[PDB]
Design a protein around this ligand. Structure first.
Ligand SMILES: O=C(O)c1sccc1S(=O)(=O)Nc1ccc(Cl)cc1
Length: 355
């Protein structure tokens, strides 16, 4: 527990929790490949349960990094190809607007305007089919990026079809188990309920509600220890023994499209390191439609990158960022959804000091 790490973390996070009124928080800093943990406050205010290294937090969109990597693993296994048309894995999707929309477009939010959220009205398989069949794109595929759960959520669901495994089974067997993420879940089991923190929205305790493609877009819950391990795995994929998983991690950090100074990966988003903090901080502020330049062909994962992902739910706020070249990373999990810029700012202050 180097004093430098202790000091920068505490000096940065304490003020943050005070200003944002965060009930509880966990932070992990990966320095030279090793993890250091920090916790504050409560996982359950009413029951006075403190946040610990075993507390589970809802990751929200950070879940998309798991989906991107699982998809990458499927490509490495030769089960799917990002160049495959969406209809190859969903024959029922016969509507003409789908011609030319590939799994790559789904995975990177470039299908042409798929909506941010799948309608809360969608509550069945036929309902989901109708939703996608009736969706009218605003742009041709591969021209504009519009962040969307309905886009990467569908990618995740189709990517696992060849395996015959459910999305949860595939995630558990192909990603969580190999990486020893034994306290990371799509559905929190009863055995872990005691560790599942409550999220707080306007002072009320809340957990994420069920929704279509929730598993694929925002369904993961994890501990600060497992997320530290997730960061280490993504920082140094060559240390991973499962060949297709190592390759899937590499594919998820490849640069497929560029918008401004950001590059879109599978789930992960990247910028060249060194980065202009104002670029990532103001850049993380909440989702617009932005034209994209295709990187043809995609650039394999660049070590000198600031790789990150912000995530939230009604009652949680999370952020992950790492720099492969420096063997440095950070994970910030909180049970209150606070402004993205504040998370990025604190994360940059910490990593910049340690770099
Ligand atoms: O996680 C995020 O940051 C964002 S941003 C826009 C959508 C998302 S998400 O769908 O993945 N996460 C999310 C956020 C709020 C609620 Cl109530 C439920 C899920």
């Amino acid at each position: 527990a180097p004093q430098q790490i202790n000091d920068i973390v505490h000096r940065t996070i304490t003020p943050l929790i005070e200003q944002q009124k965060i009930p509880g928080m966990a932070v992990a800093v990966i320095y030279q490949g090793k993890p250091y943990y920090f916790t504050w406050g409560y996982a359950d205010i009413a029951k006075k349960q403190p946040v610990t290294q075993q507390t589970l937090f809802e990751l929200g969109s950070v879940s998309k990094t798991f989906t991107g990597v699982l998809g990458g693993d499927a490509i490495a296994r030769g089960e799917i190809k990002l160049s495959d048309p969406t209809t190859k894995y969903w024959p029922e999707l016969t509507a003409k607007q789908w011609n030319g929309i590939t799994l790559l477009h789904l995975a990177t939010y470039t299908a042409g305007g798929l909506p941010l959220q799948v309608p809360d009205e969608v509550k069945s398989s036929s309902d989901l089919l109708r939703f996608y069949q009736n969706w009218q794109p605003a742009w041709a595929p591969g021209t504009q990026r519009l962040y969307a759960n309905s886009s990467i959520g569908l990618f995740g669901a189709l990517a696992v079809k060849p395996s015959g495994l459910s999305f949860e089974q595939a995630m558990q067997t192909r990603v969580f188990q190999p990486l020893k993420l034994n306290h990371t879940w799509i559905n929190v089991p009863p055995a872990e309920e005691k560790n599942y923190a409550w999220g707080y929205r306007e002072g009320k305790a809340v957990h994420v509600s069920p929704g279509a493609l929730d598993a694929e877009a925002y369904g993961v819950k994890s501990t600060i220890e497992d997320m530290a391990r997730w960061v280490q795995s993504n920082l140094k994929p060559l240390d991973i023994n499962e060949k297709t998983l190592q390759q899937g991690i590499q594919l998820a950090q490849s640069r497929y499209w560029q918008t401004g100074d950001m590059y879109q990966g599978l789930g992960w988003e990247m910028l060249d390191w060194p980065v202009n903090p104002d670029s990532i901080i103001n850049g993380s502020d909440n989702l617009a439609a932005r034209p994209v330049k295709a990187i043809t062909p995609p650039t394999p994962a660049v070590r000198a990158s600031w790789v990150h992902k912000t995530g939230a739910t009604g009652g949680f706020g999370s952020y992950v960022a790492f720099i492969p070249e420096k063997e440095l990373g950070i994970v910030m999990l909180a049970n209150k959804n606070y402004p993205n810029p504040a998370r990025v700012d604190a994360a940059w202050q910490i990593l910049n000091a340690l770099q």
